[PDB]
Scaffold this motif. Structure first.
Motif, PDB file in Angstrom:
ATOM      1  N   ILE A 153     -21.703   0.735  -9.554  1.00 61.91           N
ATOM      2  CA  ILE A 153     -20.526   0.408  -8.762  1.00 61.91           C
ATOM      3  C   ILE A 153     -19.308   0.223  -9.678  1.00 61.91           C
ATOM      4  N   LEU A 189     -20.773   4.930  -2.296  1.00 63.08           N
ATOM      5  CA  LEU A 189     -21.005   3.516  -2.546  1.00 63.08           C
ATOM      6  C   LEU A 189     -21.835   2.872  -1.436  1.00 63.08           C
ATOM      7  N   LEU A 190     -21.613   3.253  -0.180  1.00 66.29           N
ATOM      8  CA  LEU A 190     -22.468   2.742   0.883  1.00 66.29           C
ATOM      9  C   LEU A 190     -23.900   3.249   0.751  1.00 66.29           C
ATOM     10  N   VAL A 236     -16.279   5.969  -0.786  1.00 64.84           N
ATOM     11  CA  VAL A 236     -16.903   4.946   0.057  1.00 64.84           C
ATOM     12  C   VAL A 236     -18.288   5.400   0.545  1.00 64.84           C
ATOM     13  N   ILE A 274     -25.580   4.089  -1.975  1.00 59.83           N
ATOM     14  CA  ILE A 274     -26.385   3.415  -2.977  1.00 59.83           C
ATOM     15  C   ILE A 274     -26.738   1.988  -2.513  1.00 59.83           C
ATOM     16  N   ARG A 275     -25.779   1.252  -1.945  1.00 57.92           N
ATOM     17  CA  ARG A 275     -26.059  -0.106  -1.495  1.00 57.92           C
ATOM     18  C   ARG A 275     -27.137  -0.136  -0.415  1.00 57.92           C
ATOM     19  N   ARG A 334     -11.049   8.943  -1.284  1.00 57.20           N
ATOM     20  CA  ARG A 334     -11.389   7.629  -0.756  1.00 57.20           C
ATOM     21  C   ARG A 334     -12.626   7.633   0.143  1.00 57.20           C
TER      22      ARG A 334
END
Lengths: 115, 116
Positions: free
Chosen positions: B21, B93-94, B90, B96-97, B86
């Motif tokens: 991140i 990043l979502l 996002v 991987i989380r 952008r």
């Protein structure tokens, strides 16, 4: 089960951090995030951790790091427009990550001492 | 020490996620990041975890999530310009989380199954 508890608390504080990071990513605010002193880790540290590690230097040390970051957290709560500025957003994000890294190291040392 | 190992692995995969991140935040690239299969958790799961839990449904399930996310990770490695957009930033990043959240849940189930 001290070592198990250590890892549980490290997982806890990392998860708290991740949720704040994603609120900033998605919404550029802190939303209903809690300061570290009221996070699950902060509550554990103040209610149980302090007394399990009573009379050990690194306890006061973690407390100091939590208080300093609470200050930064609350400054941002009061002026989240800072999160709209790339440099100030990065600053906050580094300060939460680096606070948590330092506390994890101190936590590892504390659990070492008791073992 | 099963329960200790469980919490250690959960802390490990969260730490791997955080480092990725912040590489994206600071540099809009993955740098020297490793795919989940080669992260400390992935090495543990493949070299030890799979076999400590051999014959349990959730093992294959975790393997499937790792393989899917490795695909997404490598798509990004090959085209990091996506991280400059952008919405695509996002999205990654979502993913991987949310991959890590689901694996943590399955890991908890695996350790429960072995405790019973």
């Amino acid at each position: 089960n001290a070592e198990e508890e250590k890892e549980r608390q490290i997982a806890s504080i990392l998860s708290w951090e991740i949720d704040i990071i994603y609120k900033i990513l998605l919404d550029s605010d802190l939303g209903s995030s809690l300061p570290l002193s009221q996070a699950d880790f902060g509550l554990w540290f103040n209610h149980k951790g302090r007394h399990y590690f009573s009379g050990i230097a690194e306890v006061g040390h973690i407390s100091r790091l939590i208080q300093d970051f609470d200050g930064i957290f609350n400054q941002t709560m009061r002026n989240t427009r800072n999160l709209n500025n790339r440099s100030l957003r990065v600053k906050f994000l580094l300060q939460i990550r680096n606070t948590v890294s330092q506390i994890i190291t101190l936590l590892r040392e504390l659990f070492e001492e008791v073992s």
